[PDB]
Amino acid sequence: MVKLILVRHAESEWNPVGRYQGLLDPDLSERGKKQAKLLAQELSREHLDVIYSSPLKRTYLTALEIAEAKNLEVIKEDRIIEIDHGMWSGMLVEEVMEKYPEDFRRWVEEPHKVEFQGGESLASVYNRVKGFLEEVRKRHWNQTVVVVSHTVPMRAMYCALLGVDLSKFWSFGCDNASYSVIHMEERRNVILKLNITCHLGEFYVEAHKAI
Amino acid sequence: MVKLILVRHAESEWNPVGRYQGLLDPDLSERGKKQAKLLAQELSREHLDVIYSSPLKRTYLTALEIAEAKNLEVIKEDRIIEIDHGMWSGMLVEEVMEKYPEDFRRWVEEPHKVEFQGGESLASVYNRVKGFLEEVRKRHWNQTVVVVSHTVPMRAMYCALLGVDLSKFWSFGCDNASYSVIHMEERRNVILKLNITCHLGEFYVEAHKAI
Ligand SMILES: [Cl-]
Numbered sequence: 001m002v003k004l005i006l007v008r009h010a011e012s013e014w015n016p017v018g019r020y021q022g023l024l025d026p027d028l029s030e031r032g033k034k035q036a037k038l039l040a041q042e043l044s045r046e047h048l049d050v051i052y053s054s055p056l057k058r059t060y061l062t063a064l065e066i067a068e069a070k071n072l073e074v075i076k077e078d079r080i081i082e083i084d085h086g087m088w089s090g091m092l093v094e095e096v097m098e099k100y101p102e103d104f105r106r107w108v109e110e111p112h113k114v115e116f117q118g119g120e121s122l123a124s125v126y127n128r129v130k131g132f133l134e135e136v137r138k139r140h141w142n143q144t145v146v147v148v149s150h151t152v153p154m155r156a157m158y159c160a161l162l163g164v165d166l167s168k169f170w171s172f173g174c175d176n177a178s179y180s181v182i183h184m185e186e187r188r189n190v191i192l193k194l195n196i197t198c199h200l201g202e203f204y205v206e207a208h209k210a211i
Numbered sequence: 212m213v214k215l216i217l218v219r220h221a222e223s224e225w226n227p228v229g230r231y232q233g234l235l236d237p238d239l240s241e242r243g244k245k246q247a248k249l250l251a252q253e254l255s256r257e258h259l260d261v262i263y264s265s266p267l268k269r270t271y272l273t274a275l276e277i278a279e280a281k282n283l284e285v286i287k288e289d290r291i292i293e294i295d296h297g298m299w300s301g302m303l304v305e306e307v308m309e310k311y312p313e314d315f316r317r318w319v320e321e322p323h324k325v326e327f328q329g330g331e332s333l334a335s336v337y338n339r340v341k342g343f344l345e346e347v348r349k350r351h352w353n354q355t356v357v358v359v360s361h362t363v364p365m366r367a368m369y370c371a372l373l374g375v376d377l378s379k380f381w382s383f384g385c386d387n388a389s390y391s392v393i394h395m396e397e398r399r400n401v402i403l404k405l406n407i408t409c410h411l412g413e414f415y416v417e418a419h420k421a422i
Contacts (some may be wrong), residue, residue: 109398162382164375171373173392173403180405181384187320192384194405200396 001136002184004146005043006038007066010035010177011205018093020207022085022119023152025057029073032058035177035203040065042199043179049143052077052136054150062177065127066071069106074148079132083152093210112166122156123165129153130160137184140199155182161189175207213348213395214355216254220269220275221246221388222416228303229419233296233330238267243269244387245355245414251276253410254390260354263288264348265361273388274359285359290343294363297330304421319421323377333377335366340364341371348395362422365391372400386418 010029011032014021015105028036039062048070053063063074065104098106115121125211129149136145149157151174158172159165161182182192197204222243239247254277266273267289274285294362299307308315318325326332347356351387360368362385369383372393384406392404408415 041292162375164373164379168373168375171399173401187331188382190382190384191405193407194384194402196404196407196409198407199407 001142001186002182004074004136004182004184005048005144005146005180006056006157006180007039007043007062007146007148008174008176009054009058009062009148010039010157015176015205015211018210018211020085020091020093020096021058021205022082022089022116023056024089028058028061031203031205032176033061035200036062036136038199038201038203039177039179039189040069042068043146046145048072049162050140050149051075051146052080052132053148054078054081054130056082059150060146061081065147066146066148071147077132077147078127080147080149080153082150083122083125084119086116089119093208098164104210108170111169112119112130122169123154125153126156126166128208129157129210133157133160133184140170151207158191161191163176163188177191177203177206212353212397213351213393214379214392215262215347215400216259216355217368217391217393217394218273218357218359219365219385219387219389220265220267220273220359221250221357223269226387226416226419226422227422231296231299231302231304231307231419231422232269233293233300234267235300239272241412242416243387244272246411247273249277249289249412249414250388250390251279253368255280255355258355259283261286261351262357262359263291263343264359265289265292265364267293267361268361270361274357277357277359288358290339290342291354291358291360291364293361294329294333294336295330297327299327300330304419307421312420315421319381321378330412333363336364337367337371337377340368344368344395357383362418364394369402374400384418387416388414 011029013026013029048087052075053059094097155169178195178197183190222240224237225241264270333405366380389406394401
């Protein structure tokens with residue numbers, strides 16, 4: 001089986017204000033740098049074979065802390081990069097709600113139908129993350145694989161892994177510097193643990209709505 | 212919204228050997244008694260409005276620990292009782308595998324189709340837990356509800372909560388004395404946290420396959 005450890009990046013500078021990041025590339029916040037270290041210490045307690053990361057700074061820096069703790073290389077992986085939020089990129093949630101209320105409604109109620117103007121569709125995210133996971137299943141059988149990514153691709157991954165409709169997107173928790181444990185077994189994928197944050201202690205932050 | 216906290220009972224005396232319990236009623240193990248206290252200590256840090264429990268000893272004793280010192284009355288609930296495993300009840304997993312190989316295969320491959328000889332069907336479990344959850348959503352809106360139950364009804368609950376096929380049964384982790392946090396929201400149910408066991412420390416036990 002594959003032991004798949006799905007990690008959301010530690011807090012970026014834009015997370016506390018709820019600014020849509022997309023393919024834009026802010027640094028980790030100081031709190032996020034602390035979260036990344038705490039997460040790395042927790043994951044270092046077990047054997048890790050390979051670490052994949054979205055190439056954006058927030059994810060890559062989180063992955064580097066995990067990798068340094070185990071003497072591994074981080075493999076940058078475009079297929080797990082954040083959704084391209086297009087015109088929403090750089091906007092606050094409240095700004096999007098005011099300017100694009102109908103598009104916001106579609107995102108929150110029917111995410112599987114969304115295609116961000118100037119950006120990417122959720123269907124496109126699902127397709128690329130699922131292709132990545134299929135390749136991981138083949139390549140990394142009997143290994144432990146860390147995947148450092150973002151809420152949108154991760155939620156798409158849960159749908160893919162369970163074989164459920166992409167319309168179920170919002171039904172999975174995904175906090176900064178959390179990890180989930182998935183066993184990719186012969187007959188199915190099992191979510192053994194979802195959105196674990198105990199290692200964060202006082203640096204735990206509950207995720208923003210609509211992110 | 213309902214804050215639904217789904218708890219698997221602490222370890223019973225039959226859990227370490229992998230003996231199918233069904234409606235049989237063993238005590239908690241010594242380890243299980245400690246687990247129930249550790250879980251109670253974790254949940255006491257927050258506001259709980261009501262605690263429902265399967266009436267079996269392993270679930271009820273776990274629920275009592277959580278309630279002590281919140282001065283809550285545990286409400287016994289038949290709809291969240293363990294599946295009736297019928298003829299498997301009292302057998303070890305390895306004995307079931309040898310004696311009933313095709314029935315065991317159906318349980319692991321196509322759980323949604325199973326009806327235990329002398330017992331209950333998984334469809335029946337799904338139907339009763341779904342009705343319980345529908346009543347909880349109505350009655351306990353804006354409240355925090357603890358539900359102390361067993362792997363089989365809990366996995367059926369996750370399927371009902373997500374609005375996915377009962378064939379997805381095995382895809383959810385469910386360790387002794389774990390908790391999951393589900394928000395029952397206006398438009399959907401969200402699994403915020405699944406199968407959290409950090410509070411258990413050295414008393415953590417991984418769940419047996421096929422249970
Ligand atoms: Cl984000």
